[PDB]
Amino acid sequence: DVSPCFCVEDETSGAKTCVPDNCDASRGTNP
């Protein structure tokens, strides 16, 4: 479905994680 990605810099994961993960690295950021 149309699912906007969101990234947060998470200290718990130890890095920037996104949903979907690392959408902001690839071109799969926006649907």
Side-chain angles (χ1 to χ4, degrees):
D1 293 84
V2 177
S3 303
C5 186
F6 198 70
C7 301
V8 187
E9 193 171 294
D10 180 46
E11 302 303 276
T12 308
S13 307
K16 183 187 66 184
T17 186
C18 310
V19 182
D21 189 58
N22 282 329
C23 68
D24 177 64
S26 52
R27 67 180 189 162
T29 321
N30 64 272

